[PDB]
Amino acid sequence: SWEVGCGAPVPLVKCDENSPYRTITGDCNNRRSPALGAANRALARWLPAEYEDGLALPFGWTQRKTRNGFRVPLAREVSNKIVGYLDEEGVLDQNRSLLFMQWGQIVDHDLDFAPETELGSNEHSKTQCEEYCIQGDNCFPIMFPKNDPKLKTQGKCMPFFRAGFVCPTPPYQSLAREQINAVTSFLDASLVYGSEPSLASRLRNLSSPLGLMAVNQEAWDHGLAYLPFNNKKPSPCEFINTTARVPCFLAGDFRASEQILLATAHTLLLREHNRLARELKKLNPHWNGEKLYQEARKILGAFIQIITFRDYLPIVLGSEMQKWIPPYQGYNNSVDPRISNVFTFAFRFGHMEVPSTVSRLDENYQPWGPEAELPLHTLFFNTWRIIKDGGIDPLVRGLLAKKSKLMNQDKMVTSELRNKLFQPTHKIHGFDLAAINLQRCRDHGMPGYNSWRGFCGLSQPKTLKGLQTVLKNKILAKKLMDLYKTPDNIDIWIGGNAEPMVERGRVGPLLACLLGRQFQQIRDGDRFWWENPGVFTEKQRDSLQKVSFSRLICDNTHITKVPLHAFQANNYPHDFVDCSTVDKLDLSPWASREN
Numbered sequence: 001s002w003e004v005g006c007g008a009p010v011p012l013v014k015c016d017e018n019s020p021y022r023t024i025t026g027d028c029n030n031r032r033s034p035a036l037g038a039a040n041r042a043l044a045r046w047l048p049a050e051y052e053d054g055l056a057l058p059f060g061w062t063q064r065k066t067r068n069g070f071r072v073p074l075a076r077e078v079s080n081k082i083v084g085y086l087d088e089e090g091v092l093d094q095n096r097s098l099l100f101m102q103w104g105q106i107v108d109h110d111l112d113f114a115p116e117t118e119l120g121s122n123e124h125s126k127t128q129c130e131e132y133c134i135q136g137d138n139c140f141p142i143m144f145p146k147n148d149p150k151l152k153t154q155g156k157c158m159p160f161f162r163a164g165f166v167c168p169t170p171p172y173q174s175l176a177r178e179q180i181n182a183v184t185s186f187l188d189a190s191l192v193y194g195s196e197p198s199l200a201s202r203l204r205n206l207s208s209p210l211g212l213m214a215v216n217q218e219a220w221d222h223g224l225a226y227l228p229f230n231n232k233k234p235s236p237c238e239f240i241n242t243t244a245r246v247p248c249f250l251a252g253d254f255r256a257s258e259q260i261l262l263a264t265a266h267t268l269l270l271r272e273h274n275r276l277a278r279e280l281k282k283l284n285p286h287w288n289g290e291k292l293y294q295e296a297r298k299i300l301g302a303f304i305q306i307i308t309f310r311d312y313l314p315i316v317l318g319s320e321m322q323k324w325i326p327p328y329q330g331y332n333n334s335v336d337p338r339i340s341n342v343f344t345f346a347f348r349f350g351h352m353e354v355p356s357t358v359s360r361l362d363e364n365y366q367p368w369g370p371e372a373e374l375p376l377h378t379l380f381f382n383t384w385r386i387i388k389d390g391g392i393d394p395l396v397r398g399l400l401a402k403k404s405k406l407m408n409q410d411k412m413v414t415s416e417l418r419n420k421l422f423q424p425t426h427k428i429h430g431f432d433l434a435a436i437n438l439q440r441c442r443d444h445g446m447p448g449y450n451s452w453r454g455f456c457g458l459s460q461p462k463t464l465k466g467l468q469t470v471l472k473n474k475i476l477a478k479k480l481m482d483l484y485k486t487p488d489n490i491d492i493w494i495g496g497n498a499e500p501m502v503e504r505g506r507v508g509p510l511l512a513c514l515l516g517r518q519f520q521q522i523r524d525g526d527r528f529w530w531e532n533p534g535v536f537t538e539k540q541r542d543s544l545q546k547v548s549f550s551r552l553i554c555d556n557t558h559i560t561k562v563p564l565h566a567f568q569a570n571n572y573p574h575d576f577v578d579c580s581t582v583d584k585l586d587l588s589p590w591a592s593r594e595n
């Protein structure tokens, strides 16, 4: 294709690579190519994009237009027929805690965000897309099949706006459309600090030379910090309980208040920041603000990388972990650390892990109050349940002692997300994330299931019998064939997630390959990887090796009983130990001296 590089922002670079700290945007991580892995650039394409028209139109757009000689089925039709289930009994993952699902969503948010069009500044259209369901331009409505009960009750469609794309915003041709990753591709705590200099400074507390992140000024959690409120209008966290008028939180990533356990996880991370900036000052009273903030933020980034790579990834990828992510051998500047477009769909395996309810537990890990257990859908954009209904301790206890949902070929996504999703500005608890993932897959120009099977070196089933054997499920392969007509045409989100899970893992072979390749790249390709010689000292690394999610909980909450392995399914009190017994992070090794 030989051609030069376009880009939405300026590849305006000011590197001068002597500082020991990461930039906010990700620029300057790679010396030879300073934009690589930086926020607000195109997602990487591991395979060329496939659109209806070769350029920008998703499959499904022109109803005459086939993919490989067949019409693509409606995203909501696939949803109802394949992804849906009624019976929440028996659905829980007997060996993953709810926190395993939660960490997944955290790591995701650190790595990719491809926001719907007009990532811009403020107050834009007054949308007819929701109004009349007329497809056009960036409005790509998810239409209901007849028989869809939502037709009786919600009208003809669900709103869906196409994702923004680089060399921008309204019209373009002859290079295929590329979607934007709005956050840093590096696993770098960008969800805590921001990926733009503008949000990064606003989250900081600069009124005191202490290098602290700003905390809520209206509310405290038994003397401990909350995230600042976001004073932006309109607020969906206000929209959900007008009486309570509790806004969303302000965090390094804009989605932090999407559900209460994510806002919870963000609250712990920030707490850890300030706990970190406080300790460094004790050991180095000479150190200035900017210093304390960088060194804390750098320790926090290391904790997220290690928790993700040491604890999470091996229990996602199972026997495939070593295959795609071998033990580390230093920084390789030849590796592309950019998040691919496909990964952004691959990592949506988490949707199948979200159970239908969230609980609050007390000190004895028994139900907290009379409405301890809540249906997940009442907890989208919900921060009042945190501020006015007990702080984060009871929710953190539930993360520890309640379980993730297990993926299940006959019970894929809970109705709490499949039929009751709330999206900002759309006023009801009646959306379907599954249909959204599938409309999005098409929006982003995804190659189909077999192109990805091919990329990963796996067989590419062409018939029903071949697909039944790959899925090890006769009836599911038959439902897919009936909708799709060929396995060439199955959207990657639903084809990857349909494969049975690998041994000791929670995704199948195809996803383990896509996820595995991405993660290995974000580690090997990151100049600031905690274990890269030079980034930390030998003593600091020995100290950082003792971090666990159990110890983070202990330090930043009033919980005194934690399990040693927080991602496994744990029951109180057998698997729970005193906080005192858990390894501490030791900042002694960060002591430095002048005069």
Ligand code: HEM
Pocket: 101, 102, 103, 104, 105, 108, 112, 113, 114, 115, 258, 259, 343, 344, 345, 347, 348, 349, 350, 351, 353, 354, 380, 433, 436, 437, 440
């Ligand atoms: C109750 C919990 C969750 C809710 C309410 C939720 C909701 C959403 C929504 C509304 C989107 C945007 C869909 C679009 O417009 O295409 C999204 C995308 C996404 N989700 Fe979740 N989700 C949850 C849990 C998870 C989990 C557990 C994971 C991973 C383990 C996950 C990973 C992802 C990723 C990677 C994306 C794409 C981000 C991007 O690149 O744009 N989510 N989710």
Ligand SMILES: *[C@@H]1O[C@H](CO)[C@@H](O[C@@H]2O[C@H](CO)[C@@H](O)[C@H](O)[C@H]2NC(C)=O)[C@H](O)[C@H]1NC(C)=O
Pocket: 240, 241, 243, 244, 384, 388
């Ligand atoms: C909106 O939030 C308020 C809390 O601010 C909820 O009202 C509370 O409900 C229980 C009922 O016994 C009481 O303990 C509180 O005193 C109520 N608080 C106030 C300030 O009125 C209310 O349930 C929420 N409403 C909805 C629809 O979600």
Ligand SMILES: *[C@@H]1O[C@H](CO)[C@@H](O)[C@H](O)[C@H]1NC(C)=O
Pocket: 205, 207, 208, 210, 212, 213, 214, 215, 216, 217
């Ligand atoms: C900033 O830090 C000061 C000094 O410790 C603290 O008292 C104040 O509440 C903080 N302000 C914000 C907005 O976090």
Ligand SMILES: *[C@@H]1O[C@H](CO)[C@@H](O)[C@H](O)[C@H]1NC(C)=O
Pocket: 095, 315, 504, 568, 569
């Ligand atoms: C629970 O999962 C962990 C990691 O996946 C594994 O090491 C352990 O054996 C599991 N427990 C059981 C009973 O399978």
Ligand SMILES: *[C@@H]1O[C@H](CO)[C@@H](O)[C@H](O)[C@H]1NC(C)=O
Pocket: 332, 333, 334, 335
């Ligand atoms: C660096 O990555 C490239 C491309 O992925 C690979 O070919 C090469 O073997 C890696 N470097 C080393 C030293 O292994």
Ligand SMILES: [Ca+2]
Pocket: 110, 111, 183, 184, 185, 186, 187, 188, 189, 190, 191
């Ligand atoms: Ca990041």
